[model samples]
Target chain A: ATQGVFTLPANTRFGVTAFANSSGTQTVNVLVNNETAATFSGQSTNNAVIGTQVLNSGSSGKVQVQVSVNGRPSDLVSAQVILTNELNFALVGSEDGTDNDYNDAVVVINWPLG
Target chain B: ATQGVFTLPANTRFGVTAFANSSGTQTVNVLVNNETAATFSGQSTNNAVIGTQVLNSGSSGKVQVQVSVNGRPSDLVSAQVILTNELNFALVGSEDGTDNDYNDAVVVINWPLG
Candidate 1:
């Protein structure tokens, strides 16, 4: 499956929150210009901030977020713009591809005041 | 900068090698379907195998390799196909964008008997 890519303002601070709800191990990785900037991992549904970082000053490019379950990429990840400047991602971890429920792993990206 | 992506034969085993040569912290990540499968990190030049993994039994898609220096993506990463089924990546770590040595961090991908 194709990964989700977003463009952030040239220079700004952003926060990542994970609402993990999968019994399987889940991890969310934030990548700026293909570099890992922050990571969130858990196996429960907890709305908590995992980490935050400022985009490089004068840097303009694509930012990518990847979701992995059980050390492998799940083909059932989806992203949605739930609010202005806030995006949500949902994932399903069933290996058999029988599960369409995207609640296995959920992550949110917020660019407050950006 | 765009990350390097490659297509691997379905159901194959591959190995990754790192030849780190930077004063700055360097890391090489091998990702399958956007999932980080293996990682290699160091601050010195040492050609060594970092890890290995087999692609999903029935998976067919793009694989990506990302390189980072000092925890941020270096814009000077390049990939070259050195041999059949083998690829080499070179990176430059100077933040000023003056360094084009492409030796700061080096990674190699090899697929044998795929």
Candidate 2:
């Protein structure tokens, strides 16, 4: 499938709220520019806020998040990237974070701005 | 020394920009509620944005950041906790992160808001 991306503002807070609806444990990781940023560990039917990071402080980078489950590949999981400038906020859901389609994750700030 | 704390606003973007002017590499970490969040690594006279996270989306938590240099413990460094409400912005610098003090780090959001 395809991964979703959002052109988030620089020096903005971006987060992911993900959950796994499986019997086994779920381990999720949040990455920015492919770097391991946030880690979330939970048990069966787990839901957690993986983590958050700042973007656009200097140069722009990729904001991607991925999820893994020990139960099923497409175990009915939900993930979203939380974007906020404090006064304004935006939530961009994963394009196709299904159990069988867990390739990458939703990305934020796909725009080139100065 | 004493760790500086900032009561950052909820659902906001908070980040730390740190540097080290030592000969060796510098490794720094950012934490929230004592949880390891951001990791920054650099070499001689280097600067980096460890990482950033979202705060107050749900409940309030502690924001702390610490730095370590391979050459000098209290090397010349700069750290700050960035807070924003989109329209308005606030920056709180570290209290006493000198050449001899590397106890903890600057903490943000020392408030009890619901």
Candidate 3:
């Protein structure tokens, strides 16, 4: 699996959307300072706005996201995060397989927040 | 700076394009298994293909990309890599400043290859 880590400003908010575009089951986990902040799970071609939360208002924090497929911890999965704008990012993931399409699970994080 | 690490298949090829989108000078370094493989530097709004190289042909390898601004090693910089497609990614960066507009540099790596 793959993860993306970032240093975020205090009181920053996080939002997530998950797309299940593959046949296999998938899970996307969002974390703040090594703690699970939110999780989304599903199968098939469904998608949803998972949720959003605010960071502590006093100090900067580290944010991370992990993706996995079919409940397989050792599966060959990958995650990529792209900064769409200042302090906002989009993350995409791929499940265990030779296809490497990376579209198995699509996620948008920390976006449209002020 | 933020980095994205990936486990890639053996013999994979890497390509890079760098864009100088900020007033501050910037440098981008791409590495394979912790060793520098390519470097690009420039200022202003110009962009280039940079170059490409094949990974060692015997085994899988780790790929990393680091971004910094204005020669400041301790400057607050950040990098975001997004999988545009299978095994292909676009990396974007921001330099030190209150303007978190992570557009100081833009890079595309390992795309359009078999």
DockQ winner: 3
RMSD of 3: 12.6
lDDT of 2 by residue, B1-114 (tens): 444333454444432333333344555556665666667665432212233333432235455556555433332222231112111112222212333322122112211111
Per-model TM-score, in order, reads: 0.39, 0.31, 0.43
Summing lDDT over every window of 10 consecutive residues in candidate 3 chain A, give the lowest-scoring window: A73-82
Tens digit per residue, CA lDDT, model 3, A9-59:
555565666676777777777777778877877777655434344443125
Candidate 2 residue runs with Cα over 4 Å from true position: A1-114, B46-58, B71-114
Best to worst by DockQ, what's the order?
A: 3, 2, 1
Q: Model 3 scores what on Cα lDDT?
A: 0.56
lDDT tens digits, residue span B1-114, model 3:
244445445566656666666666677777776788778776675544333444441254566656677566413333444442234454545454566666666655554465
TM-score of 1: 0.39
Query: Cα lDDT for residue B112, model 1?
Result: 32
Q: List the residue pairs that clash in candidate 1.
A: none
Write the number of the candidate with greater TM-score, choosing between 1 and 2: 1
Q: How would you order the candidates by lDDT, starting with the best? A: 3, 1, 2
